[PDB]
Request: fold
Amino acid sequence: MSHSLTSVFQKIDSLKPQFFSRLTKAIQIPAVSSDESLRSKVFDKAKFISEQLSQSGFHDIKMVDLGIQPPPSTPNLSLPPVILSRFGSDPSKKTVLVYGHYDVQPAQLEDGWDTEPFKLVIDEAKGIMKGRGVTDDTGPLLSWINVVDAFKASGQEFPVNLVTCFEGMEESGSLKLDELIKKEANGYFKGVDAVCISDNYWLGTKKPVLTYGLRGCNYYQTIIEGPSADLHSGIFGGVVAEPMIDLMQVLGSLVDSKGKILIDGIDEMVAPLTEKEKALYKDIEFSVEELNAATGSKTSLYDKKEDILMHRWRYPSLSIHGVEGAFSAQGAKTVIPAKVFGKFSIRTVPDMDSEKLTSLVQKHCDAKFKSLNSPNKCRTELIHDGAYWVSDPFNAQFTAAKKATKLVYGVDPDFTREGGSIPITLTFQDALNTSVLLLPMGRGDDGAHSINEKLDISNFVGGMKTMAAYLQYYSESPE
Amino acid sequence: MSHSLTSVFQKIDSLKPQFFSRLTKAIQIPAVSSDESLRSKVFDKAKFISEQLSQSGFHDIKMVDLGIQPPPSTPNLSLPPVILSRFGSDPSKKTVLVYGHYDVQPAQLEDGWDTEPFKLVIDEAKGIMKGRGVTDDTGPLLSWINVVDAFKASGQEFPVNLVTCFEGMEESGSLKLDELIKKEANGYFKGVDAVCISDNYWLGTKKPVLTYGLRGCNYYQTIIEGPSADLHSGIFGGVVAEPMIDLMQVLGSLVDSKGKILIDGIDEMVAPLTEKEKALYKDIEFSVEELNAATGSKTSLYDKKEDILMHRWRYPSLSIHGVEGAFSAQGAKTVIPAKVFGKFSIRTVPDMDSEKLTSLVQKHCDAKFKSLNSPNKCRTELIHDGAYWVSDPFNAQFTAAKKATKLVYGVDPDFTREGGSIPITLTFQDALNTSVLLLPMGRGDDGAHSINEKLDISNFVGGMKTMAAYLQYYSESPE
Ligand SMILES: [Zn+2]
Ligand SMILES: [Zn+2]
Ligand SMILES: [Zn+2]
Ligand SMILES: [Zn+2]
Reply:
């Protein structure tokens, strides 16, 4: 019970009522960063969090202004502030920086939610919390504060100096955060010894994991324009060229129904499969039956465990998200859309270069479009990019985290990679020159970016205790 | 000046202030039939119209209830009432039934409108009225009442017995109206001698037309379903099959970028081009430059006048409208949609059979989908169908209408067909066994189903006077 972790573990149980309360208030402020009309909510969310920091012991609190929303439509809307804080300033202790994000994906009841997405429903009988942002990423984020509180209530010494970096643009490209970290590497973040992030999930639903790899993400829109305004599809049908028709062809040329990306040049950039990397992949626990459970269907593209895992983790993927600018409500509308935007993204792996990938994508789309012999205008542009990240899971942090997991969940965690992405992870590693650990709180069926997003209370509590032991053990590790 | 048409023409000018006023109130009630939340507005619109009928001389007014919204999502919403009325009951006069529709396409400022779509802006200096529904179809509809008023104010004898049939589901499949006409053929409509419809436009912007043909319309949705809910595109990317990916392929197989429909079986049903029909096509005035003006671009599929006309009028077309169930807002969303609906319609011509076309469409979509080797579910269904219609433009009505047009616009109208559709036109002809005339009020660049829908005041006034002379001349024709 290192400096009595049992004391801390006990307080974590006792304080569940205030933790729940804190988490309810947070979830109720709909910090949807992608929604301009809710930007003010995003600020209230940041404000609420800074208030929790301050009520707990945190100091040197800074609501950092990245500036005005820019990049590639903004009415001079300010960006959500990045929240920096410290807890403790003992020069003999290690300093751990924790990062998370307080903005959240959009959500509406009518999307199919069983409960209202921004009313956090807590069911201690089933042991689940249902609400948008509860696993991605407001639950895990607030967990760091809960943990500070538990050390406090248990009268136990906090094992490290905590430093916080909470942004509110993660669901919207993490704009400008990149620059902040680099700018502050020899400033607010000067003394950092390590970075921990809780912003992903267990592979499955039964066994905890530690994550040593993330895919990157390149998000594209293909824009096709024709007439100057929408056209009655009857008056002009068969006589003017249709952006929607070209677009089905261009979009339909990016990837097949088996998952094979059809863009020339990508496969060449994909790092080959090594025996070293192959070692780690075995002994994982996972089956397609689990994938089917999370999916809610039998629609996997692979049956072999090795295949499912490798195609989630280390082979790229291309997904097609939807069309902007056409007719998307229910029923019928007889219209020829004037200007449409096809949405699609690529999950990047080593060793894919962002730049080259974008060129390849443009080259492919331009060429396909030109082969249509269409009078329409067309071009493909990048909306946002985020780097992939791979690390060796043997350094001090993973060891500390491994013992922590073992302590709480009674088994050693699998070592896994992630299909998902956390864009700044690489920026933390390189800019600060420290190791990064990913410590998933929730399960792989939590429904992030979907309806009925849930966090199991067992993962909530288990994850907090795991965060507590991890900080404790890390503080004890010789390096 | 048949029974002083000049008197009637003069009153039509003098009464422009009340006509404008009447038209403003109507346009302000947003009878968007496709929008459940606005259904109540649709009823107010019907109510408003019945009030105008009654204030003018109309009698035997009936707000006919088609029943509860049915077919292929409805919370037992009642349908908009069909409005039947008569003006005059002289047994020695001919009876003309006029049909139009008081519901309208959806509209929002943010779609790109220069003015607020449901605030009718009337600019007598430019001579335009801007508002949703002003040409399609509320302007023309109300014109019939204006005309009754003008005869009244001019103290001139109304030349026929007018009978009205105004529905509020035209933009939503004209549900149940079909049955009403057939049911009432030997009832409310027993004495009808002729049917006139003002619900389309001049071919171009310079020369009035009379319309003797309409294309039909079959509206389809292809439904592809996979997982039970949306999936994080990163967690599941490359590993589960994507409905959106299949859908781009199925949809992208329906028609090329030249306008060629790719569904087997359709061409065979297309009636061959005759010398008779070819006669009428010549002497039309139209050029691609005009098409470009209305389009706002240079994106025609044909340069030859004959080709543009024949591909608008008598060859089928396939348009692709948009996708329901995916991501359609601006920016980026990393999601794999669970269940998507691809929207597309076919403009039918003789001699395409509705039934067979639907089979061909299903056969094609099913086969394409199956060739994808996808674990997903898929099926294609018809949302609504409306018949094509072709008539000989030489009967009493067209002659009457021709002289009327000549009188007002000083030239004889071109005889044209329509790319657009008015579903019940055939039902009127067959069920009542009379001729049908289409008397376009507006121009072909009015922007129906688009942003900034306009009606030129010259067409408004010209069309009213043309409607007046047409009723007068028809009343005089020996048959
Ligand atoms: Zn997220
Ligand atoms: Zn996340
Ligand atoms: Zn319409
Ligand atoms: Zn119409």
